């Protein structure tokens, strides 16, 4: 019965801040401590603080005090979250718990970059050479440049699924970059054509890009 | 200041085995220790609270106990649905901290990597930039090492790796390399090369290709 509900993600500025929300319901609010919690892509959970919304006393991790702001709205049983002076090492996803981490949250994503909405480029990834005859070829795209999340990625037109991954996005100098691997038998490629689908919906962008050998070639790309 | 020492950060397991996660606290925190399970989707649940109380909906196979300073999580007969990440905690002293975490993965057999390198393509030397990509394709276990050479020569600067998830068809990993270089810099240089080396590697696997040939 008890649940708590965040707000959406967010993608904000160095230097701005963001305000984030966490509704709390079936449980009387005042009761209960409100905790924030913090957690890096691909790291462990860090402890923020907590909240007693009765008197809206606050106790902070002295690694983020200043850096984050808990207060709560004891008539909207909402508690807030407010980040400032954002950068890089804020982006995170973000949890709302209610004590003694009973209870949780969805977690909101909090996104800290300069750029504005960018397509991606989408760039070819054929061998360097080493033609092997009778077994598999790895070819790939390069996704890159591009913000905010997320992109599409399929391998003709959903044709080739046999030997696909796409590796997950690194948001590296404001911007995002993510490469796809596709394996197919060495008797269909160069001999039939290998495309990779790339969408892009903030900048509304869709693009095709077939894959062709190497060589020294110039000008490949104004064809394929 | 209260640390908790959780172990392994990575636990290879196998469906229907019983498995034990470990986290130590530096001082004495009596019962005060709280367990979290984490989805893949990044929601979280609290399995266990005080030590050994099983939360709502927690499956028995669930358990958790303490001895001296050294808690542990128990489970059972591990599911499918449990090689996920887990956390211990403490709220015996503010502020309160939390283990390091531990990701369960499923064991397999080893398998070694394979390498592919993909020189620029000509349309992103047009536009000022240079990426050279490596692939290191379906290979266990996830630990591996990669590196980039110019010329003969290490680089470690302007590298960017990325690694799949456990693949839910046959348990391998994947990585990619990316060396992103100025356009100028990569004129400069003839050949380049991903050395990619693992437990299966008798010796390491090189990859290269050099950029005055075709
Ligand atoms: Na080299």
Sequence with gaps: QVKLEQSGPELVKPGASVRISCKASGYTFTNYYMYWLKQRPGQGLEWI???????????????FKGKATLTADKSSSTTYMQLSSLTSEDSAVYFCARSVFAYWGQGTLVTVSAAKTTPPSVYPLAPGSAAQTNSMVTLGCLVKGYFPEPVTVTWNSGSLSSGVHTFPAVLQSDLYTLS??????????????????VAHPASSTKVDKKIVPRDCGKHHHHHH | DIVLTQSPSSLSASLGERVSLTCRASQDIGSRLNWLQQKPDGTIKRLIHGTSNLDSGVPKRFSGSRSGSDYSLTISSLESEDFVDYYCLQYDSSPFTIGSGTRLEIKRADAAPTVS???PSSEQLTSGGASVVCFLNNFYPKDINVKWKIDGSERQNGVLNSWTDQDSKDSTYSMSSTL???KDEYERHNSYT?????????????????????
Aim: negative net charge.
């Design chain 1, 49 to 63: 603080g907590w909240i007693y919304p009765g008197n809206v006393n606050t106790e902070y991790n002295e690694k």
């Design chain 1, 180 to 197: 796809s691997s596709v394996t197919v038998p060495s008797s269909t490629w160069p001999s039939e054509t290998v495309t990779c689908n």
């Design chain 2, 117 to 119: 390198i993909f020189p």
């Design chain 2, 180 to 182: 992103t270089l100025t």
């Design chain 2, 194 to 214: 991903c050395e990619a080396t693992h437990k299966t590697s008798t010796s390491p696997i090189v990859k290269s290709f050099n950029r005055n040939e075709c």
